[PDB]
């Protein structure tokens, strides 16, 4: 009975999204296969057909714009948990962002968003250090090519993140070998090719009927049955009824279904939230329909104009300049060997019975105007800000939602004592062991290490990159030195800081000397004992 | 710093039982003060034991070490009432001190559940009329491509919804 | 009896706002589906349907301008309230603004405002930290997509903020199964699908018959029945009647109705004000009717003109440059394989009985000034001020009303001692208990510290951003140092102020050293015990 309900829900979402679906297929075929559609193909007359697009430089400069402004996701320490666990979580998030597949997914999805609007990569988890001894898992992200063709969001959800959705399908048109390996990496390979992964979120919503007493009110009457279990307790309590907080418990589930036959997998255990995270362009509802827009349609119309005028001009060019004459067959009855083009005769001979020619097409010379008319359309209808704010802020929303999903997966995974490498800010990699406590010093009471086990809020802060802020600081302090009297300790302190803020392999020894001195007059606090001995030997002097 | 010099004094004495009990009572005093972290009190307690006999302060230490900080803050901050309590007899002085310490109260964790939870309910739309228009537009699209079977099924779905 | 009264009021408001609703949805359909209205596709002669709009760049510029103009909402501590509770309340407003959902709601509202005119987002509160132990809640803001038809304001209200409106509906749609599940989540199901969420603001309007005695006048005879109860007293009082101060008590109420069937929910309480706060464009009354505008009407006319002239251009270009001849069928009666276009012969044949051709449409070259004039008009009439003053000041009024409702609901919910984190200015996060009933040690009173509950009025100051103020202060002070003799203590004071006023992770060492120094010679008061120790250590030196 489950199969037909799932199919009905999928069909409903399919129909609801089908407009944006066909429209995005048109867009991707435009931007990835050919710029000319069938619509112009039937409504056209030129013969020699050529498309010289200029949209691709535009999309390249746009994706460069999204590249030059990195987006970072932070983790709010909630439930009174220590900030350091959030710091460690940001460390894992960064060390998972620095991996190559992370850029692969991000770039593919953002490029599809620029052209189509939705690229929507998907989170994945897998075993690492392949050995039967360990069961530690890592978390990766898998991009979906033409995600608008293989990602079907729930129609009821009305969210940027689509996190309002309780379910989503992912179709997979597989070949024979495609069906084989696709099934075997998850399930049995018996075949009924359209296969799908119906993801789904189950939830548990109740009333919980909280009660109050003379003493502080503990949770009472969690369910409807509980009230019938406490019929005397509800009446004899100091306070009868105060609130009905509807606590909810939700769980995501993955199902492997097929269009024709029955589903191959019923429900699967994978994290807490949907591994799929969508990216949107300027997206909204217009008379209650999901609409999201990119830069393909407007630049597309401009490109169609420009390509049709250039092909018209080429059709003008594609002809022999020689004039084609008009005369009777009897008018050249004696002279047929001359009017052939293969020879050059001194004079043209004609019999008794001053002729007309065929008018070759000519340029209107007005085609210039419209040429750049188009040009202007394609190269500034799209852009000109410093960035198309909607694109990167939708990207930031996608980043933060990916943050909560990744945090949920990590919480659902990282319990066993593990050792992981943290990519700190400034890209400083560092190995940090997760847990197994190690006997306490103060109390000898376990105190599980780190224990990122918890509940944090993910939030991004788009703005000054670390490289940008450090360059600004270097320029600022350079100006300061340009406007600072010498001799004063501030001058030298700023000098040392400037050497500290420089590059690596080149000025590493001067930077180290500056750090040493900074620690030695006490401005910089010691973090390693050698600096402490340097401080004490300086201060005793 | 005063805790540190009292620590030096305990170490000097150690290097006696009454002085010991008094100094652990003063250590709980300092723990309570650090919980309070009232800086002007640091002068208040020592001005207090300057004003009062050391035996009275020692008994205050012994009977209630952490409540001693609060009462000495009250008495130093209000030296007049400290003088009247000193004048009136010692046993009822202890009665008044205990009543003042209880006056400040402690751990009032009665109830923190809720206060008039309002109708905090969300909203939802499934865009069903938009879905009717959607079926109409798939009908229009199928008309263009000549997909007759899908066209007729879409027509039936359109006519089935009122 | 209630349902038909609600329906009559809704229909009256719907009839009053029908013109605004249709024009706004027309503008959206123009801007969001197709810029060619039905009249255009009617009144046209074209065959190419291309859409070369320029509205999106201008909208992007405007939205960027609003984004770069942050708005803060302040709360005046009224009735002699402490400034600290108001400060914490602005901290709360800040810590609810920076949440991604609130910002997204704001963006959607403003973009659909610049598009149609109205964004009117929706507040919402819900249980936070789901656990039957507690009942604490947070408040969120969710946008209303295409609010011009899903939100129906009271017709009788005549405010920008619509505080006069005592009712407003929210429109949704259900499928059948959607209908039963929506009922099950809330209410019982009556089978039939458009729904309405008709809210209510009811008030108790009384005169209170304020009475005075030789002593100061206490409120006497609150009701009219009370006067009948004090007939002897009113003649016994020293003063029988002076004033009739109309004290009022009002509450917002929530109800769920449906179009055909009976209402789903009769009476529900959520706060005291209508959570919906609307935004408007150039809004006013034109002959006793509400009107709000956008930047889409005249710009829509101009965009239609540009699109149709460019379609003229494309259609003129879109035909074969080759010339089509006209002749009798017998004129080439034998020679038909000549005139095919499939081959090119040196010459072409004509029998006994110098021919006619088809006139090709040609570019006037006079189109130019039309194209560039329309382009300039559509770029200029929209924008360019430094900001479209009506839009951001209307947004400021919307922020003021939003903060008003925020204060109301927070007063309505946050009576429980709770622990809330404060996002102060410069985004400085810090966690503080709501009341913190801890008793005074110098006084002995319970003295709940903040007790944010009270009555505060909102007032917004758009202008110099905190980052903007920081940057301009840095510029000013660096100029001062440029024009200041060195050696003077004021020189070093300004230096230290600058380093303190600098950015974070970059120059934190100079900033910390500067704060240390400034505390040490006493310019700034110490704040944490290390600072006091540093100050006293310097003083004794």
Residue numbers in the entry:
A (entry chain B), C (entry chain L): 6 to 197, 217 to 377, 388 to 418, 443 to 599
B (entry chain A): 71 to 85, 157 to 303
Q: What text appears in the publication on this structure?
A:
Tailed double-stranded DNA (dsDNA) bacteriophages and their eukaryotic counterparts, such as herpesviruses, possess a dodecameric portal at a unique vertex of the capsid; this portal serves as a channel for DNA packaging during viral assembly and delivery. The portal interacts with multiple copies of a scaffolding protein (SP) to form a nucleation complex, which initiates the assembly of the major capsid protein (i.e., coat protein) and other minor proteins into a procapsid. The P22 procapsid consists of an icosahedral coat comprising 415 coat protein (gene product [gp] 5) subunits, a dodecameric ring comprising portal protein (gp1) subunits located at a unique capsid vertex, and an internal core comprising approximately 250–300 SP (gp8) subunits and 3 ejection proteins. In this study, we present the structure of the SP gp8 in complex with the dodecameric portal in the P22 procapsid at subnanometer resolution.
